[PDB]
Amino acid sequence: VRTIRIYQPGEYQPGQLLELSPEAGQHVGVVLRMEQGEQLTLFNGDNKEFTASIERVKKKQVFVRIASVLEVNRESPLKIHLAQAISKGERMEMVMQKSAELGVACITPLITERCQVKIDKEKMAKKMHQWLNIIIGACEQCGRNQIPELRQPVYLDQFVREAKEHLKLILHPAFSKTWRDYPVQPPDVALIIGPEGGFSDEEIRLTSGHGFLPLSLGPRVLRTETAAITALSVLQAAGGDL
Amino acid sequence: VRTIRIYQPGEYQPGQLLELSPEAGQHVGVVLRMEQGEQLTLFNGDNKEFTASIERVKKKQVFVRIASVLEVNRESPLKIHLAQAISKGERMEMVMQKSAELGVACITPLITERCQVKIDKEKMAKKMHQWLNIIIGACEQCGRNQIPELRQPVYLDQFVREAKEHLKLILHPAFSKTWRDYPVQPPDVALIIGPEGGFSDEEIRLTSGHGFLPLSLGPRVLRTETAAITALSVLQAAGGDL
Ligand SMILES: C[S@@+](CC[C@H](N)C(=O)[O-])C[C@H]1O[C@@H](n2cnc3c(N)ncnc32)[C@H](O)[C@@H]1O
Ligand SMILES: C[S@@+](CC[C@H](N)C(=O)[O-])C[C@H]1O[C@@H](n2cnc3c(N)ncnc32)[C@H](O)[C@@H]1O
């Protein structure tokens, strides 16, 4: 059995008793049901890991004894900024979880013409909150000791205007080329993946106007959430740490 | 936009009047509520797309008239054999779907040491039916006109003994070799992926001894079902049609 990893930002040092955050301590003592003397690895989002053991469980609060600090970085050298068309429900959560597993540096939810979602300020905020916790959960899972940035949703126009990454790719069949036709390598990539219905010709004219080049992923139509993970897999395997 | 795709095995020809299989009629007649006169693209599993029109719908009996046949092959030239350790519930469903979207040729459900599944012949024949249907659904969605082969569950020990693919790979986070260290090319490749708990040292011992060579997918630990998506994406990108 592997050791449990818990996100706990902030600075602290070995030998120090730490009171776990509300969510951290509620994860450990309540959800995981762990007891005094059990072991834990904490990470702070800054690429450090802290070995620890549970000493006192008082209600939902959890106190942990730090054993040692170690600098452990599992980031890819290829920084990909995913711009993912918003899908309803579980598929978007799937993308949030697995794109973090695949080293994604930064995620922008994208509102595009053929997205089928209701854009409510209250609703969007809840989604953003839920998405960030899924990301942190995936980072506890996969070993990343730095949380990827989850940026506020923007329309296609804004994102394509502000995009400054050195390689800029959109998943779209027309005039597309495979990963071998592009210079996939650090520093960074902007990657647009669209909604189930795809993109309008006007949207392609706008993205193509701002330097986004068309990338294919084989002759089979991939689902929207499949396409994110496949695209990240292929780009990391080409010019990252896969 | 594009016509609804329905898997319909068997032999049939342009100009025939054809009664759809019960599951196909259920899908067309009840789920999708399709009307007489609407169009279907049937595929029989032999890289043929039949254009047909719905001539009568009576609950879940559906009769179509075949108009034309077109040979259309969306199979990867790399034949990948995924042997996926069996995981709980919806994780394995994701593997079946994504791997068919990704062009997998053959799937073997795999029983490894740390799998936590009750070996029940009633459960397992049922589960094999549910996995098959997820696969078939995936070919309908993604455009494969040929169903991947779904084999019976076998234990790791037997699978590794019997494997005959020209390139054999075992996926484990504590490896360092990447896809670039191997001749990933036709005809075929066998790939072994572990459960949520991974492989034991004994299993790594066993598979290495039977010629499965070590493959890593970067320094982050992927969920069992993420690893199937990433591994197939990378292998199709390297030697298939991605
Ligand atoms: C990834 S798809 C999202 C929709 C997905 N089919 C679903 O069910 O949710 C978004 C757009 O990406 C494009 N796309 C999908 N697979 C592709 C591929 N293999 N090569 C190039 N573009 C692709 C398609 O044009 C699609 O309209
Ligand atoms: C959740 S992982 C198993 C974790 C477990 N603690 C272990 O490593 O022994 C499930 C499967 O995904 C595959 N996998 C996950 N990350 C991988 C990586 N970075 N490189 C190669 N295989 C990986 C392995 O085949 C593993 O058995």
Numbering used by the authors:
A (entry chain A), B (entry chain B): 3 to 244
Excerpt from the publication:
Here we report the structure of Apo and AdoMet‐bound Lpg2936 from Legionella pneumophila at 1.5 and 2.3 Å, respectively. Comparison with similar structures suggests that Lpg2936 is an RsmE‐like enzyme that can target the equivalent of U1498 in the L. pneumophila ribosomal RNA, thereby potentially enhancing ribosomal activity during infection‐mediated effector production. The multiple copies of the enzyme found in both structures reveal a flexible conformation of the bound AdoMet ligand. Isothermal titration calorimetry measurements suggest an asymmetric two site binding mode. Our results therefore also provide unprecedented insights into AdoMet/RsmE interaction, furthering our understanding of the RsmE catalytic mechanism.
The methylation of U1498 located in the 16S ribosomal RNA of Escherichia coli is an important modification affecting ribosomal activity. RsmE methyltransferases methylate specifically this position in a mechanism that requires an S‐adenosyl‐L‐methionine (AdoMet) molecule as cofactor. The protein comprises an N‐terminal PUA domain and a C‐terminal SPOUT domain. The latter is responsible for protein dimerization and cofactor binding.
